[PDB]
Amino acid sequence: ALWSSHEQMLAQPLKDSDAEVYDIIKKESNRQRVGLELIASENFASRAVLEALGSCLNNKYSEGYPGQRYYGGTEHIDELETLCQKRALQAYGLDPQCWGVNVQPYSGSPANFAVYTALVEPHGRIMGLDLPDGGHLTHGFMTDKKKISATSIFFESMAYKVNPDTGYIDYDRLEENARLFHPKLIIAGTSCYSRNLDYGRLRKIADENGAYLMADMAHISGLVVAGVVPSPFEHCHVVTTTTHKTLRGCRAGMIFYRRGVRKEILYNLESLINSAVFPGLQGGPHNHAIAGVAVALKQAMTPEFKEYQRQVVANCRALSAALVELGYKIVTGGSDNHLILVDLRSKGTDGGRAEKVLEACSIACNKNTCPGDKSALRPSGLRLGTPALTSRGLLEKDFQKVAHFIHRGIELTVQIQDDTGPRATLKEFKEKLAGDEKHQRAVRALRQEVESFAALFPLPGLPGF
Amino acid sequence: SHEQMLAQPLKDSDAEVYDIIKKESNRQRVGLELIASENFASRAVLEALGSCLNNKYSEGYPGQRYYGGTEHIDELETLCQKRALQAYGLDPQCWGVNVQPYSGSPANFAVYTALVEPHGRIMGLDLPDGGHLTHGFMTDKKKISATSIFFESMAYKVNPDTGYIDYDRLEENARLFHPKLIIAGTSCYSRNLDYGRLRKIADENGAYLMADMAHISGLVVAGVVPSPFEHCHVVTTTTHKTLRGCRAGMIFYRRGVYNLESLINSAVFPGLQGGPHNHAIAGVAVALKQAMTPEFKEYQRQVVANCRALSAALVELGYKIVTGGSDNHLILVDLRSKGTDGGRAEKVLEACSIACNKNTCPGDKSALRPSGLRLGTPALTSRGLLEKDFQKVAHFIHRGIELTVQIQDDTGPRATLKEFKEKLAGDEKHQRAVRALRQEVESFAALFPLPGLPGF
Amino acid sequence: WSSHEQMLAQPLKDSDAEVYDIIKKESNRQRVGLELIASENFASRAVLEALGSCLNNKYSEGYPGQRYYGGTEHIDELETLCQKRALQAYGLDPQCWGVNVQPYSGSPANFAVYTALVEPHGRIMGLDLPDGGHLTHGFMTDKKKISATSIFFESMAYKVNPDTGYIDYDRLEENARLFHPKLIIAGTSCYSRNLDYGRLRKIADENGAYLMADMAHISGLVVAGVVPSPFEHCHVVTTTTHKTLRGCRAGMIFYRRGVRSVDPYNLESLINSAVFPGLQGGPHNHAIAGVAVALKQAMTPEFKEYQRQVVANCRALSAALVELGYKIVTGGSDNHLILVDLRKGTDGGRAEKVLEACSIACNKNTCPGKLRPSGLRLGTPALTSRGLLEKDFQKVAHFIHRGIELTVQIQDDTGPRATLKEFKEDEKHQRAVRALRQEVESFAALFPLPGLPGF
Amino acid sequence: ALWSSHEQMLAQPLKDSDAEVYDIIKKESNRQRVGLELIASENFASRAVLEALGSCLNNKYSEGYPGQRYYGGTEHIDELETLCQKRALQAYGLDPQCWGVNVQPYSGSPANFAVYTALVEPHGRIMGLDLPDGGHLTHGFMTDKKKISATSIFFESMAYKVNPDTGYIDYDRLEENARLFHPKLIIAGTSCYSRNLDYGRLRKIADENGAYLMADMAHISGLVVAGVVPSPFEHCHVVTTTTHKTLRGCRAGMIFYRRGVRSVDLYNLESLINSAVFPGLQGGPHNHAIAGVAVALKQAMTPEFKEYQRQVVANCRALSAALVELGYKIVTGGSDNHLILVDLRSKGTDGGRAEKVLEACSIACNKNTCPGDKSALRPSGLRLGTPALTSRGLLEKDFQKVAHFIHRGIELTVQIQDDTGPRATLKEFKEKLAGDEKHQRAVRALRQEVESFAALFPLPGLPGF
């Protein structure tokens, strides 16, 4: 009686099949185009990458690995996953006899948890940079009464902090505490840290306690491939990372691991990690995303990419320099990478407040706590990254105009705080910011300008989509 | 290097990947895709996956985000939840839903974390009886599944003489094990589950009754099988398979009197996941809207019609169908009913371009000799195949099996089936037959449309 | 203040009149009563004499040959001697069996074995409590875990057929395939029958699990060969040193030595390491001494006859209550005890209280499926150590019988909403309680009370 | 067998029922009489106590508690357990409105484990003084590859150390680490520490992390009752202890706990601790031992006992002073209690060697590492306690002659180490002490004068057995 319209329902372009969702995608693209994206974890994926996501690769189930699958008809997915692993090892200049890699993790958090499952039995001890000091949830997060992060729930985690007076990680206190905590694995990775990680030192600390040194290069993965920051692959046993962010691919994760001699006493990391990801934690691999990651890896090895990362770091340096010239304090004085933590205290306000004033001006960036911050209830900083805007073509001069936009945003934030009063609440702040001509007026002007400037730049991706 | 490759198309930026995708699209077109868990996503859905939604981080939930600029992602995730609850005819005052799970397995593990603390006891169908890894799975050594590592799982089996679940033995064993949660869901079970009974057993032990409708999610939306939302406290599911969307998962939960919402939500984040995959959420949304169309409803009826026809055909051809038949989209064929196993069959059928996988089957020689083949109809039905067509498919599979009992008898009974794969290889005689059959199968499958983008 | 040396020497009778009276009042209580609690016995004078030796003063952490303190020469003779006698008493070969005699009690011994062979969260399988299992074999509810074995380990129980009172070895065999136990327990606290160790062994091997026997209740029966030995099939056998072995309170852990499935057993190191530096501290040498003394007495002919008599009495008692129309689970017993199903129209919950008021000691048992104990467990070791024979145990059966008539009596006068109420016996009852108590105590005083004089 | 032989076997005095054993006992008593017992954990139980152990109380099964038993006929055991709890709460000057106590623990280690089980679920975090610094196994013990103490096996333990330069506990580092470890319970108790514990400071640290402060007064329990050292019952939520050692009772343990309002409202320790001991971990109580503990408690409240404890501390002060006058170094310079940790390094040897030379001279005492000691194997010190010998009546003068005996012991230990050859060690040392004349003749001489003097003092007990 039917089955006639059915064929086309599964054939029409998104625009007609569902106007609502399509309308949402179009307003998102406009939003991304006129705004100044400064969130350190954001970037814009190339057309080639996005083009792969929508392929028929979405349809195939390939549980297992090349050579050892559970389904039939994986010949092409096998070339794909294999090809992707080749490029992944290549992109980071790794030798196949000394390194192996898994490309099925669904995202960044899944990769980390998989490595914990494979090498750290349940309740095994894990050590990672404390959250308020730039750490990531997946590195463990708990309070004096509740285990929040799943890494803290299924395992025993204890954090190491950074020196409150330098913003640097306290390798000395980590070394000492590792002897009392007996970690099975130590994490070398940050989410809001503007400096390089002393992997060499961390490696010795691990070896002293027989622990594994796992690096989480999610934020600097792209910087590493381009050689603008030391590689973690020269000290760590395992390296996990997201494939988006500075690597500029689609969302997914990878787990790199050592192979060979640690021929007396060998690395049995491959078997574990692989079994952990499957049949351990994941099910069918998302081949379409694996393709996207593959495409990204190939672009990542081009000189244009190395060029891009070069510029990403230069821009952070210009931004970092301009805000300083304007009197803003930068945690640890500056950066070695794509981001910087601005301690808004030097201006008499917090990132909790600036977060809002700036967002209303189409300048995206998120609040974050600086060393010593009394409460996470009122974070003294703002994290700023350059990958996104640099993928847009902005150069040093441009980022200097950005620093000024951000600056004005902070002044309004302070101007408004003058009214609310010191003891004023955060709810009261948004209230006063939301209901006041003097302010709303300024917000209309700033926003206008910020957007005007953004509109002057291209926006990578499926054309206006 | 003032070059901007951020725009050059895939066909130019990466010919290698481009080829693999082209070769995969042709492979999918000329083959008879019978794997029960596969389907072909619509073009609209795939289109969404490549949108700019890929670029936004929106950790948390609408109303409660950690980032700024989520106005549109909020409208999306919210829209998706509306459609999810709608598709299954659920009342928002009684049901809530989380649409951030990255896949099917992540969704289950999230529910376990939220409702079953570590080491909590879970009960699910034993895998060899059609259960899924994520429902727990272990041995006398390295527990394969993570659900079996961070939790204490004990399985319930199906009657070996009927292929049916032994709800009686589960009821008794639940009194000794004290499960905190019981799973109602299958990966290879041709029948409807007695949710009502499973509900009565959960309550008897204060346990939660979690349904995993991943395999019949599409069947359920179109009302071709009873709904699990009628008895269960929680229902999780993939968004692909019979729902025909992109890969992702969802978690439905009860609201009223009951704080499953808080836990589940906190479990997915900041518990187990990070940034939501908005582009995939969009894809699931698009699929949900198509799932509520009449065209979808008929498609599902057809999917089930085809399964019966196929089942019937293989039966008329003397093949053993576990429990005699099916109420859904799949059937477990008991090999050995022709004198062979799905272990080798999967390999030859595969060489003939007929895709389907072997399956543990009730007890059998577990992993050593899967006395069965699982066959599903969603994928081919999305292609338009009707009963008559599936009748011809049954014959193609049949011939595949005859060519299997063949190479087997021609293979030493010591069965170095780890070379059988090699005896299929090179041996021009079998490779000859493989081609003869493969030819006919591809000619026949090309007669039907391949959903998705163009020849991409 | 200018003394103290006086105090250290003064007899307890002077130093503590309160405790002394308690001891005397407890000794008289034990003398005039009919002790039927299956887990109770009367230690000999020799044993009790050892408990008060100077052995109480030495710390000897570790083992003979490998101590952490100095001056253990004599404690080393002791522990070693005790181990020799322990293996001997059960006719075991040192090349095949080894033993650890430091466990503080029965429950500590089991927990030590679990810790040594079953890492945390390891699965253990044991007889369900209501079916005669012991707490230490795991015990939990739909809601919470009551036993530590159930808290630091994942336990699943196996039940006894509700229609026969017999263990369902079939359902255990099947369930063991789904649960994957790392260790299965062969032992009971209230089961009148012999366990099928051979079958239990065939089931452990099928799952690669260990077969641990808990012979606490029949330890004495085993030494005298009045019941099959668990050392014929089990990898490990734990046990109390009191109960039917008639020693002081303490536990032991026997283990296999040699090769399990060699083809070109290290239970010793593990268990030993588990007891120390694992779970315990300083051994209780004075108690080890008391266990040694009891083991030597356990190998005498006088002990063997005693055990035969213990079983003879149980049969007689069982038979008598049967002829009295009482329900004995599984119809009878192969050992020292029997589970009486008070159905007579009452329960062991209230029975225990009245019989207790009549000076007939025995506790309520959790018969096969209700906080509402349905039966009464009765043991003969204690009274038999007193010299009672069949004829005497026949008169005991009647004393108990009358006790039940006075019980099943107040239950009609009761609520039926019993509870703290029923714990009221009015004089119409107190008078009877006294009439029966007299008759019991007078008969009870016809027999010798082993051990040191109650004064 | 004639039931008269059976009835008599159960009636014969030990001397006749078992010769081997009765003979062992007799040789042990002789040994204890002629030797100088200096091991800090050793003491001599009174006759009254031992007399209680052998009572018929051995026979009764009384699972549960007074008022709520599982067996019938506990009338007298109920007076006993109740009586014992009254005295336990009394001896320490505790008010029943604020404190309760369980007297069924079989020993010291069982009491601690019971408290962990009741208040700290499995894998809960526990913090205790590191073993090498004077901690006890039950407070947790593990290495960088294996959990040894059961406390470390069924729970997550992390230790807090003492300052290597003072021998004092580092309350500052504990405070800091507690914030990263999030302990659920902190242990205030030592096995080899000559100083008082800052319970008030530890209590604040617990409260800062919502943790319970558990004190383990096994070593100073008797000192506390007599008030010669501050009481732990002033700051701790729970106090566990052995009943032997300085309390001079039979082997057993007790668990004291708070009752009433913690600050909430209230304290919920009673139900848990009691449920943990049973049906949790233990079975039938050892009533005969509970009686012994009761008798000891009554003696513990006499003025003779308080007199004894003062003398115990006075003797440690004389002994400590004498060894110092002879040039021996005492960790932390001295002691506030019954023991002292001598750092044999000042003489060029170790407690591993002195342990043996001194034991062969009938002078009992055990080796023990001193702060900083280069990873055990060769522990620098010797622990020395005075309870045992003081219960024997030794006074200041006497303990000065002991110091001299010990001194000579060390010289021999070094005279032979002179033949040793610095590098040649361990198994070789003993081979020389027990293999060449001059020394043996030296040992025979010393030993003799040691035993003679020892035979000049009484020996608490059954007057011979």
Ligand SMILES: Nc1nc2c(c(=O)[nH]1)N(C=O)[C@@H](CNc1ccc(C(=O)N[C@@H](CCC(=O)N[C@@H](CCC(=O)N[C@@H](CCC(=O)O)C(=O)O)C(=O)O)C(=O)O)cc1)CN2
């Ligand atoms: N009912 C049902 N069907 C389903 C699923 C499901 O969850 N349930 N799946 C989900 O949606 C897919 C299958 N997924 C599975 C993935 C892993 C394991 C598993 O048992 N894992 C172990 C042991 C297997 C094992 O090692 N196998 C044998 C033979 C080797 C092997 O690969 N065997 C093949 C061929 C079988 C044969 O002919 O021997 C096999 O399929 O088992 C061994 O001892 O080494 C592992 O090591 O990964 C099982 C099923 C498809 N069909």
Ligand SMILES: Nc1nc2c(c(=O)[nH]1)N(C=O)[C@@H](CNc1ccc(C(=O)N[C@@H](CCC(=O)N[C@@H](CCC(=O)N[C@@H](CCC(=O)O)C(=O)O)C(=O)O)C(=O)O)cc1)CN2
């Ligand atoms: N087969 C057998 N017989 C044996 C033993 C054995 O191990 N096995 N024993 C060894 O050699 C002795 C008995 N020892 C026992 C010790 C504890 C429990 C027990 O069930 N444990 C807890 C449960 C509490 C419990 O879970 N509480 C519930 C209510 C259940 C319950 O029974 N309620 C009341 C009792 C009824 C009443 O008076 O109201 C209660 O206060 O516990 C809760 O509300 O939290 C207890 O305290 O009774 C049973 C027997 C003698 N006979």
Ligand SMILES: *[C@H](NCC(=O)O)c1c(COP(=O)(O)O)cnc(C)c1O
């Ligand atoms: C006992 N002493 C050990 C020592 O160092 O000499 C002890 C105990 C254990 O008691 P036990 O009867 O179980 O052997 C527990 N806790 C402490 C602090 C000490 O000191």
Ligand SMILES: *Cc1c(COP(=O)(O)O)cnc(C)c1O
């Ligand atoms: C396929 C399936 C899953 C898991 O799906 P993935 O996204 O591949 O993890 C979960 N449950 C059931 C019942 C399934 O059939």
Ligand SMILES: *Cc1c(COP(=O)(O)O)cnc(C)c1O
């Ligand atoms: C009595 C008994 C125990 C425990 O003995 P306790 O010394 O009181 O802890 C253990 N197991 C069984 C089978 C028992 O009968």
